[PDB]
């Protein structure tokens, strides 16, 4: 952590927002954006997990203070019915999101503008993992920006100090 002090942050990291809000909603069922070794230790019985992986798609405008990404939702569990009901719950908690706030442990509270839908649920065939049931879907999530002020100034004075 040696980033310059005059710069604090640019984006919101909406997947961190989503994983934190899902963990806070139901602490009993863990959710994240990786594959912990503890979860991979047991496969016949698996704790239901919600995974969010960023996918390409969607432009961005700094002037309009609008950001969007095709973040996908992947749920894995030991039963097809459990996976389907978890996906239904996630869709009910994501699709009807129009101007909703939620605060992170960092200190700022993010603003979700609209969470769209691109592709429906995908019951992937069991490959490396057989017992676990996995369902994949993609959401078009648009989020606001924390700070949109431009950093032309500091770059310009750094350039002037370095060369002139």
């Amino acid at each position: 952590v040696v980033l310059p002090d005059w710069y604090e942050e640019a984006f919101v990291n909406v997947e961190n927002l989503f994983i934190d809000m899902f963990t806070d909603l139901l602490p009993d069922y863990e959710s994240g954006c990786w594959a912990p070794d503890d979860w991979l230790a047991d496969e016949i019985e698996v704790k239901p997990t919600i995974w969010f992986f960023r996918l390409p798609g969607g432009r961005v405008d700094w002037d309009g203070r609008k950001d969007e990404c095709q973040l996908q939702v992947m749920v894995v569990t030991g039963s097809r019915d459990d996976s389907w009901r978890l996906m239904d719950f996630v869709r009910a908690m994501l699709l009807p999101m129009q101007g909703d706030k939620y605060k992170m442990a960092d200190g700022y509270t993010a603003q979700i503008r609209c969470a769209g839908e691109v592709a429906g649920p995908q019951l992937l065939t069991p490959g490396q993992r057989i017992d676990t049931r996995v369902v994949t879907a993609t959401f078009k999530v648009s989020v606001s920006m924390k700070s949109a002020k431009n950093y032309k100034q500091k770059l310009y004075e750094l350039w002037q100090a370095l060369r002139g």
């Binding site: 959710s31 994240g32 990786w34 070794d37």
Partner: peptide
């Protein structure tokens, strides 16, 4: 030997 377990944060 280096030992470490990746959490949900990756």
């Amino acid at each position: 030997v280096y030992r470490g377990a990746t959490d949900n944060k990756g």
